[PDB]
Amino acid sequence: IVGGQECKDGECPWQALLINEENEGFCGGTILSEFYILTAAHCLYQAKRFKVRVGDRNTEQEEGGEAVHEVEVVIKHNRFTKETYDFDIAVLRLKTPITFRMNVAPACLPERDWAESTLMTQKTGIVSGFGRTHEKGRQSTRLKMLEVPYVDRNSCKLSSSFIITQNMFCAGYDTKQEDACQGDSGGPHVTRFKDTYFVTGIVSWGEGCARKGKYGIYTKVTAFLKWIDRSMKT
Amino acid sequence: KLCSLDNGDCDQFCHEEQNSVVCSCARGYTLADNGKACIPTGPYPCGKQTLE
Ligand SMILES: C[C@@H](C(=O)N1CCOCC1)N1CC[C@H](NS(=O)(=O)c2cc3ccc(Cl)cc3s2)C1=O
Ligand SMILES: [Ca+2]
């Protein structure tokens, strides 16, 4: 995350972090329930064996809420394509259930029509992660969050050198120095409505980080609600 | 009109049926007696920041 603020105690409890063999983060996720994590399909090609960590806000100290979980099954969208990042979505089933507590809780899955007409027409969403703090910088040891405006679809299409499919949306700023970045991919995009937070997107891709005339591109979760429901039944 | 006027007074999901508003809630909440508010069924309901 470029810019934004630190998540304070209890503020981003649905954050998951995918960690490699060396206990290093390479992507994010969203806690959907005690057995399931939402992430990006493209993240799966970034490590041979990985685990999932929840309840962590500072990777340099022990806070008391941290828990590591092994993955039982990977469910990747079969229509995912590396050339365009279309259908960039996957669900992970964990071997043991997540025990909810301070800093460990799920985000809500919305219904499609209400989310599209009411949530995605709000001024902003919230993105979060342990990714780079500057395009060429190193990964953050602190969990960060950032408020990002929804961007007009036509403007987004004009600004992009790469195709924006019906399965993607845009968010962020034209020139202001605030955006998601490398390592945040697969992480939560959520929208607040009357003090309840609903999943609205998955951190997907971007031409650099916080570049002028460029936006952040997110998987459109609302196009995948029946798909997500099927995956969570097996 | 209806769901377009302040979310039909619903806490969460709003749906229009035959010139009338119908409210509903995310999984883990039950609709209150007034047919509008959403009440958490148990500890750590979805979408809430944690405080204790
Ligand atoms: C243009 C895109 C890319 O390589 N594509 C190829 C496949 O088709 C989609 C685009 N790209 C180039 C570099 C970038 N990698 S990144 O720095 O890890 C990254 C930056 C960034 C910014 C905002 C968001 Cl929301 C996500 C990401 S993540 C990235 O995703
Ligand atoms: Ca820690």
Among A17, A99, A207, residue whose Cα is nearest residue B44 = A99
Taking contacts as CB-CB distances below 8 angstroms, the residues of chain B near A13 are 49-50
User: For domain A1-12+107-222, which architecture applies?
Assistant: Beta Barrel (2.40)
Q: What is the domain extent for residue B46? A: 1-52
Amino acid found at A111: E
Among A221, A222, A217, residue whose Cα is nearest residue A203 = A217
Q: Which of A107, A114, A117 sits opposite B47 (nearest CB)?
A: A107
Ligand 1 pocket check: which of A205, A209, A211, A219 to mutate, most ligand atoms within 8 Å of Cβ?
A205
Could you give the maximum distance between any two Cα atoms of chain B, in Å? Answer: 43
Return all residues near A93 (Cβ < 8 A) that are at least 6 apart.
Answer: A35, A36, A71, A72, A73, A75
Q: How far is A195 from chain B (nearest CA, A)?
A: 7
Among A58, A26, A21, A51, residue whose Cα is nearest residue A40 = A26
* Rounded (10°) CA dihedral A136, A61, A47, A96: -150
Return all residues near B33 (Cβ < 8 A) that are at least 6 apart.
Answer: none
Question: Distance from first CA to last CA of chain B, Å, rounded?
Answer: 40
In Å, what is the CA distance from A146 to each residue of A1, A4, A29, A31, A225? 7, 4, 16, 18, 24
Ligand 1 pocket, CB under 6 A: A 84-85, 162, 179-182, 185, 203-207, 209, 216-218
In Å, what is the CA distance from A65 to each residue of A16, A26, A35, A56, A98? 13, 21, 18, 7, 11
CATH, residue B4:
2.10.25.10
In Å, what is the CA distance from A55 to each residue of A9, A157, A170? 10, 37, 28
Q: How many domains does chain B have?
A: 1
Amino acid found at A37: I
Tokens matching residue B20: 């009338």
Q: Which of B26, B27, B50 sits opposite A103 (nearest CB)?
A: B50
Domain with CATH 2.40.10.10 in chain A: 1-12+107-222, 13-106+223-234
Count of CB atoms situated within 10 Å of the CB of A41 = 26
Question: Distance from first CA to last CA of chain A, Å, rounded?
Answer: 33
* Expt. technique: X-ray
Contact A29, A39 (CB under 8 A): yes
A13-106+223-234 is classed CATH 2.40.10.10? yes
